[PDB]
Amino acid sequence: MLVKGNEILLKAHKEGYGVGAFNFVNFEMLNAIFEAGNEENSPLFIQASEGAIKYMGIDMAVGMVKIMCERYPHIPVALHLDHGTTFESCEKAVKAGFTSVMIDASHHAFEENLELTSKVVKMAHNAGVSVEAELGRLMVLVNPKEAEQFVKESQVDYLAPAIGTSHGAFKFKGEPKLDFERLQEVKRLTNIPLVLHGASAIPDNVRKSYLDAGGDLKGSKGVPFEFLQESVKGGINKVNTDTDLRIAFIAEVRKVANEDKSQFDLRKFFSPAQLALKNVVKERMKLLGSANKI
Amino acid sequence: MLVKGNEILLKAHKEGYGVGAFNFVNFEMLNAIFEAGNEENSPLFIQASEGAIKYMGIDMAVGMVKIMCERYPHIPVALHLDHGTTFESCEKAVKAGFTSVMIDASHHAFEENLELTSKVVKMAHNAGVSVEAELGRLMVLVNPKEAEQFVKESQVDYLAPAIGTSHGAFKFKGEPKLDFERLQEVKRLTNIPLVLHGASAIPDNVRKSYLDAGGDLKGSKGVPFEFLQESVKGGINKVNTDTDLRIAFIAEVRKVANEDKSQFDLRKFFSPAQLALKNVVKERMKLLGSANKI
Numbered sequence: 114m115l116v117k118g119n120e121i122l123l124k125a126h127k128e129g130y131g132v133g134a135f136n137f138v139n140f141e142m143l144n145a146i147f148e149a150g151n152e153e154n155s156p157l158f159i160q161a162s163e164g165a166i167k168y169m170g171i172d173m174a175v176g177m178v179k180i181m182c183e184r185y186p187h188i189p190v191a192l193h194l195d196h197g198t199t200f201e202s203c204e205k206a207v208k209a210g211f212t213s214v215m216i217d218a219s220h221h222a223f224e225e226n227l228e229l230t231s232k233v234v235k236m237a238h239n240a241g242v243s244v245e246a247e248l249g250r251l252m253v254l255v256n257p258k259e260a261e262q263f264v265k266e267s268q269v270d271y272l273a274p275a276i277g278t279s280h281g282a283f284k285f286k287g288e289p290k291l292d293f294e295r296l297q298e299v300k301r302l303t304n305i306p307l308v309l310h311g312a313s314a315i316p317d318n319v320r321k322s323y324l325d326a327g328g329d330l331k332g333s334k335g336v337p338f339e340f341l342q343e344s345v346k347g348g349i350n351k352v353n354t355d356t357d358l359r360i361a362f363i364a365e366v367r368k369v370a371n372e373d374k375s376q377f378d379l380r381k382f383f384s385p386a387q388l389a390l391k392n393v394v395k396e397r398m399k400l401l402g403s404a405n406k407i
Numbered sequence: 408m409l410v411k412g413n414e415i416l417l418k419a420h421k422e423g424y425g426v427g428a429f430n431f432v433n434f435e436m437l438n439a440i441f442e443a444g445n446e447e448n449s450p451l452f453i454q455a456s457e458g459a460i461k462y463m464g465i466d467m468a469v470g471m472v473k474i475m476c477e478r479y480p481h482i483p484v485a486l487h488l489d490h491g492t493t494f495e496s497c498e499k500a501v502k503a504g505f506t507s508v509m510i511d512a513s514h515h516a517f518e519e520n521l522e523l524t525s526k527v528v529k530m531a532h533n534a535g536v537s538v539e540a541e542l543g544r545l546m547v548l549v550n551p552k553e554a555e556q557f558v559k560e561s562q563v564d565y566l567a568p569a570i571g572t573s574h575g576a577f578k579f580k581g582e583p584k585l586d587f588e589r590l591q592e593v594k595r596l597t598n599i600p601l602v603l604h605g606a607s608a609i610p611d612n613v614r615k616s617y618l619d620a621g622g623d624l625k626g627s628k629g630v631p632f633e634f635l636q637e638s639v640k641g642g643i644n645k646v647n648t649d650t651d652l653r654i655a656f657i658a659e660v661r662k663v664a665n666e667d668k669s670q671f672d673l674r675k676f677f678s679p680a681q682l683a684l685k686n687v688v689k690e691r692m693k694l695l696g697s698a699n700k701i
């Protein structure tokens with residue numbers, strides 16, 4: 114059923130596994146994510162950015178998710194606001210029925226980030242909603258002693274510490290590198306669920322599908338599977354994944370468009386796109402250790 | 408709000424206009440159709456084929472529509488099962504919350520069509536749901552005296568009489584031709600709302616967009632705008648439209664794929680696709696006379 118974010122992540126935290134947090138912008142993405150969770154018996158975070166919420170309308174975003182939770186009531190699901198930018202945005206998501214919200218004030222100095230985060234936490238906790246915050250900048254790394262105080266004072270439920278990742282398909286020039294020692298220190302000092310942003314891997318098969326369909330991914334590099342596994346070992350419990358989904362999905366859309374110029378049945382485009390997305394999610398659930406955890 | 412199909416079509420019947428009945432298979436299509444209706448102050452039929460219902464899940468098809476009706480409560484909307492093939496399918500739709508159902512048994516002989524249609528009508532009317540049936544074969548044309556007896560005996564709410572159209576983008580091998588005298592006789596003998604299937608026009612601008620984006624529409628031909636207007640004059644009150652929507656939508660998808668091979672943001676594909684679909688619907692509402700009828 115639809116539950117507080119912390120209900121899912123506290124379990125992941127205690128048992129040392131990762132739960133994928135999968136972005137959606139419409140029905141096709143949502144359906145594929147839920148079918149993956151059903152097929153792998155995995156809990157999941159379903160998340161929507163502010164842009165996605167604007168696109169769908171927050172009423173439809175929450176509404177569709179509730180319908181899917183009713184279709185699959187045995188799956189623990191948290192509905193999470195990804196990269197909330199203002200107190201007001203977070204409050205709107207709480208009122209609409211989100212069960213987790215991220216307030217991202219990581220671009221502010223420590224004091225201001227702590228202050229805004231704490232304000233969101235008071236409001237969210239009053240409504241029974243879990244809160245994520247962020248420390249460090251994907252484009253300076255997290256300071257573990259800052260993280261310690263930050264969590265203690267804000268009472269935030271989970272923290273996203275910057276350790277080397279970044280959003281999108283172009284995460285690394287040269288060999289991929291993440292600061293796992295910094296990750297481990299943050300984990301020890303905070304003892305709460307941690308969140309990894311920019312965690313798409315861009316798997317070989319997905320890259321190939323996109324390129325075979327005429328796509329261009331020059332210079333793209335994701336987080337290796339091995340690094341994702343090491344992140345979870347290090348204390349990451351929520352793993353934000355968006356780019357892998359988009360690439361897998363759009364690869365199939367491009368392929369259909371290429372192979373039949375007379376094809377305009379939407380389902381012929383989006384059925385294969387859903388399947389590719391679903392498969393990426395299923396594999397990731399197995400990789401992170403959330404499979405068979407329901 | 409969401410209302411029985413007859414509420415909308417009895418008004419269209421009395422006042423002599425046509426209401427577009429627009430197929431959807433997902434959120435993007437549904438949203439564009441509703442925005443069109445909002446912007447043209449037009450009632451609308453939103454319809455889903457059995458295939459589309461299988462694709463979405465009937466729970467999501469109805470659920471998304473109810474969310475949209477709550478977002479635009481001033482718009483009269485009927486949710487209609489397009490081409491129901493069995494009593495059981497129609498009954499499932501009634502139980503799920505559809506407010507109109509089509510039972511299509513037009514491939515059977517008169518007696519069997521009447522028998523099945525009558526059975527559906529009894530079940531649907533018990534639940535306050537309006538029913539459409541079909542006479543003739545889109546490919547033999549309706550027999551007006553048959554239609555008269557069929558409507559009387561079945562107590563069906565609206566009838567789709569075969570007068571020369573067919574589904575899809577390839578409607579005519581020669582000059583477009585419809586039997587308007589046959590239409591008028593059916594209208595006169597039945598005095599109920601009538602339905603035009605296969606009513607897409609494939610407008611010049613839509614075709615051009617699709618072609619420009621690398622699509623192939625060799626040989627395609629729809630119902631001319633003038634024929635749609637003549638249909639409405641002749642008594643057509645519900646105008647089924649799907650192909651125009653698909654082509655306009657997919658044209659934009661193809662265009663985005665072509666113009667940027669590195670683009671995989673779903674919203675970059677589907678925002679322009681929604682807009683093109685919305686515009687087709689807005690123009691059609693004006694053409695059929697449902698604009699400014701709320």
Ligand SMILES: [Ca+2]
Nearest residue numbers: 217219220247
């Ligand atoms: Ca940030």
Ligand SMILES: [Ca+2]
Nearest residue numbers: 511513514541
């Ligand atoms: Ca038929």
Ligand code: NA
Nearest residue numbers: 195196215245
């Ligand atoms: Na997040």
Ligand code: NA
Nearest residue numbers: 489490509539
């Ligand atoms: Na119909």
Ligand SMILES: [Zn+2]
Nearest residue numbers: 196280310311
């Ligand atoms: Zn992020």
Ligand SMILES: [Zn+2]
Nearest residue numbers: 490574604605
């Ligand atoms: Zn039809």
